[PDB]
Amino acid sequence: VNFPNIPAEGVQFRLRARDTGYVIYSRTENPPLVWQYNGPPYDDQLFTLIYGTGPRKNLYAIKSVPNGRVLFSRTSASPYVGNIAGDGTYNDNWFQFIQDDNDPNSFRIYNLASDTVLYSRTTADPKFGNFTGAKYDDQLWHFELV
Amino acid sequence: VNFPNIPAEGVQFRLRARDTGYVIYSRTENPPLVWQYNGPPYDDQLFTLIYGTGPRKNLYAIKSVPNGRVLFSRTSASPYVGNIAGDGTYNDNWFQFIQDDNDPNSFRIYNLASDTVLYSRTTADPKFGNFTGAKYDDQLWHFELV
Ligand SMILES: CC(=O)N[C@@H]1[C@@H](O)[C@@H](O)[C@@H](CO)O[C@H]1O
Ligand SMILES: CC(=O)N[C@@H]1[C@@H](O)[C@@H](O)[C@@H](CO)O[C@H]1O
Ligand SMILES: CC(=O)N[C@@H]1[C@@H](O)[C@@H](O)[C@@H](CO)O[C@H]1O
Ligand SMILES: CC(=O)N[C@@H]1[C@@H](O)[C@@H](O)[C@@H](CO)O[C@H]1O
């Protein structure tokens, strides 16, 4: 089931992991350009959604407020999770927000092109990334409206 | 996770529900045109896949062998599950095959446009249809190779 509380188009938010409490950032300098962060609020943690239509209905591009780049999640080349300019020019720029089967208040950030979800953990490196496999709690996210 | 054993493009198969053992049929006359059936093998139970590309990567159109129509699954209008001429003109003609979380050999027939899965049951009417909500075993299918 699609997450029932997806922010309206253009509404700004942070993406915060339910369990770690870390947020995603998307920047243009100093790789990794997309990663998780535990610290003060920076503008590169702010996102809006571009609503997919037609073949992209129920998918969304995740766009950076300060730099305008959208996220991608792929398995073909490094970096696997990154950003790129535009408004979702490429297939792997498009994400589905899938409500958790148990916790109705959180969702997975799912990529149709790559069949992956984003995760945030405190355990094994890489501590942030994408993943194809079983459901784990470290794949659960919140929209944090600002 | 996408079902790892999706038939090659153009290969013929039946869609049989794991629990009821009923198969889907798709015909042009006598409604319901798409429904479940408990009985002998007939041509209107035979399907092939059109492989989606580009924005439809990891999605598939399900085409009927004897009549050439593709399936649809929608919540907008009755019939909710049906067929239509073409090769996938509409977004509700496009399906993802999502492996079950527990049973690696079965999958849900998921529609991105409508956020529904197909089900087959012996209990309440309608005994075949689509559904937006929790995971139930009556939503599990096999590709039956012919
Ligand atoms: C002083 C400095 O570089 N701090 C960076 C900041 O620029 C921002 O990218 C943040 C993630 O929101 O990560 C921090 O490590
Ligand atoms: C053994 C191990 O590292 N397991 C992790 C699992 O805990 C979870 O983090 C998942 C990503 O959601 O990735 C797996 O590789
Ligand atoms: C005008 C209208 O309703 N168009 C629908 C279309 O949206 C789609 O549901 C299709 C089945 O793939 O059936 C059509 O009748
Ligand atoms: C309350 C109720 O009847 N729930 C059913 C559920 O058991 C299952 O059959 C599902 C289809 O997967 O449809 C639901 O309407």
The CATH number covering residue A94 comes to 2.80.10.50
Q: Which residues of A touch B96 (CB under 8 A)?
A: 112
A115 at the B interface (CB within 8 A)?
A: yes
C-beta separation of B45 from B23 below 8 A:
yes
d(C-alpha A69, C-alpha A101), whole Å: 31
CA A40 to ligand 1 center in whole angstroms: 9
Q: Is the CB of A131 under 6 A from ligand 1?
A: no
- Contact: B112, A58; criterion CB under 8 Å: yes
DSSP state of B115: T
Cβ < 6 A, ligand 3 pocket: B 72, 74, 84, 90, 92-93
Using CA atoms, how far residue B90 sits from A59, A120, B24, B67, B95, in Å, is: 16, 36, 21, 18, 11
B13, HSE (Cβ side, Cα atoms, 13 Å): 19
Task: Write B81-88 long-range contacts (CB < 8 A, 24+).
Answer: B81/B34, B81/B35, B81/B118, B81/B128, B81/B129, B81/B130, B82/B33, B82/B34, B83/B26, B83/B28, B83/B33, B83/B34, B87/B50, B87/B61, B87/B63, B88/B50, B88/B52, B88/B56, B88/B61
Closest ligand to residue B132's CA = 4
Print the domain residue range for A91: 1-146
Using CA atoms, how far residue A82 sits from A19, A74, A140, B17, B81, in Å, is: 22, 9, 19, 39, 38
B28 at the A interface (CB within 8 A)?
A: no
Method: X-ray
Resolution in A: 1.5
- Contact: A91, B57; criterion CB under 8 Å: yes
Give the count of domains, chain A: 1
C-beta separation of B22 from B37 below 8 A:
yes
